[model samples]
Target: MKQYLELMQKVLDEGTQKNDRTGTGTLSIFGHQMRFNLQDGFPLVTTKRCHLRSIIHELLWFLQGDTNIAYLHENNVTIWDEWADENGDLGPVYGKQWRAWPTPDGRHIDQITTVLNQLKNDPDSRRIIVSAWNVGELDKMALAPCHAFFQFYVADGKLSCQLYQRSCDVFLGLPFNIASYALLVHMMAQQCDLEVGDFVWTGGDTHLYSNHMDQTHLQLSREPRPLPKLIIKRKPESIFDYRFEDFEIEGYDPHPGIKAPVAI
Candidate 1:
């Protein structure tokens, strides 16, 4: 995870302070990107302990086309709890937009299903895409998306994904963001019967929340541990079918966990 370490160090060594929604503010950068090949190892953050269980279930929930926080809460994941409304709705968020995007007509579109079919039938097609930025449903959401959109590409029997995060809380959010997409890529590759490939991450308003600057600097001073191997126990026949108990991680030797309050 040296790549991730380098990114944090760079931002700490040279980032500009700016006001943000958190009121705690930020030390930010405009645009930045990082890439990781899954063949090397699972990209879970080794600098600080990361919970892969929640990440896996979160991805599964997204792919299941769910926008409510109920399932997440039931599964012991509180990460999204603070953002949910009284009815437990998060509106047309990632899941709803990715798997059930509303159309002008009374119909919905499942971008993931379409992309999967296209990869099998027309791998060379330039339209393999999935989007979570449904402008029409933005107001209904508790918060607008930060990780706005993503795309998948396949070449030489290897599957890769790229995420376009419109904004990122570098210290608190970017590490999880990296793991989420990397896990997504691995899951998708398995479903497609292809090898896990590169994960390309692109960001827009990437920054370290002001409250975490000191912690970020302290983290930068620590050496990163070796990347671990994530093993999915029961390989579901489809990406859409996975349970919380089906995944596990081995060889993870991360630094102790750090507590950072969410901006929400």
Candidate 2:
């Protein structure tokens, strides 16, 4: 959890300033990486009172292969409201790419299924991967994938995963991303009967928005609490079958949530 705060502080201390698309300035760093060891505990940020409600909903939505925000809204999550069209659609975004990637020859590739087979059948292979960056459908997507690529590697009967996020907001988005991937790894490892290992997050265009500087400092001022352990209530038939109710985080005491402006 302190590693998350370190990235926030490093941005404030040494980040380069640059103007972004919304005319808001950002303190940018070219790239960064952080690793969360699952054996320790779940990687939910503990410096502030981080909530996982929306995070779990979004990840479930992505796994369901539905791009519309209708499901998200049904779950009382409004994070994707801005990106949807009048029909509450987001074109072919992460959900579409992750579960059913379209091909010019009219075939759909299920990347998740592929990764599952490789992890179970060929655990020693270095090629187990899932990618959301579909060049063929980029033009049709509402938003390009930020957490673009991921690879799962197995050693010592433990499954470790690495994610490559092309761009991320360190102050806001990165925390959720970390927990999302960490949860994903847990679910995947469980389904494959493998132990959990490290989740290494590799970022590009890692940044803290100028408007979020005060909240960033506020969070950095707080000391990190002990990491919480995750308890999966039931073993789902498949990774896609998990609901929000099936997972729980234990012993997550933290400071108050800090308010920050979300820059577009």
Candidate 3:
């Protein structure tokens, strides 16, 4: 949690002012990365209370190759609600591109499964990666991916993941992004039968909106609670198979959840 607080303060204090897609503008920074070793504790945000339900379910839905928001909405996760079309479609977004990325001749690729297999079979493979940025289908999507792609590195029997987010609204998005990807790393580690290693977050258009500057500063002044521990209820034997109830969070105590309007 302190790691997250430190990051927020760093970006707010050091980031440069810049224009962006939201037209709300940003205090943008070029490159800022953080690496968390999961062996310490789960990386859930404690500056503000973060719900693990949405984070875990969202990741599972993406792994399931579902572009429609029905499953997400059914689970009460509204993070993607604003971006979905009338039919709950966000075409070729994370799930579509990650799992069923279309090619010619009815062929599709499952980047998640492929990457996991590669990690197990060839831990040294430089190609262990999953990308949600599908340029070919960008026009069809409701919104492009903010956390666009990720890569896995395995060394010393420890597996690590690095996420490349092309855009971020620091106050609202970064905490969830940190927790979601860290959980992803934990799950990936378990499935691969490797120790939890580092969760590296790399960003490209990482920014804070002009409106949240005051609140951001206030948040930084607060002391962070201890990092929360995630207790995945079901012992998932594989990365691809896990239900929403299979996960839980423990030892999390934090300030009230902050409210910020999505910039869609």
Could you estimate the TM-score for every candidate? 0.96, 0.98, 0.94
Q: List the residue pairs that clash in candidate 2.
A: none
lDDT winner among the candidates? 2
Tens-digit lDDT track for model 2 on 52-133? 9999999999999999999998889988887789999989999888889988898999999999999989999988998899
- Which pairs of residues collide in model 1? none
Q: Which whole-number lDDT from 0 to 100 does residue 47 have in model 2?
A: 83
Note the Cα lDDT for every prediction shown. 0.83, 0.89, 0.82
Q: Could you give me the TM-score of model 2 versus the true structure?
A: 0.98
Worst 10 residues of 2 by lDDT: 255-264
Candidate 3 clashing pairs, residues 3+ apart or interchain: none
Q: State each candidate's clash count.
A: 0, 0, 0
RMSD of each: 1.3, 0.9, 1.5
Q: List, residue by residue over 1-264, the lDDT tens digit for candidate 3.
A: 776777777777798888766688778777878888887888877766667778888888988889899999888988888888899888778888988888878899988889888988899998898888888889888887889988999998998899999888888888788888888887887788888889998888778888888778778777887776777666576788887777777778887777767675
| lDDT for position 34 in model 1 | 88
lDDT of 1 by residue, 159-218 (tens): 988889998877777888888888888777777888988999888877788778667777
Best by TM-score: 2
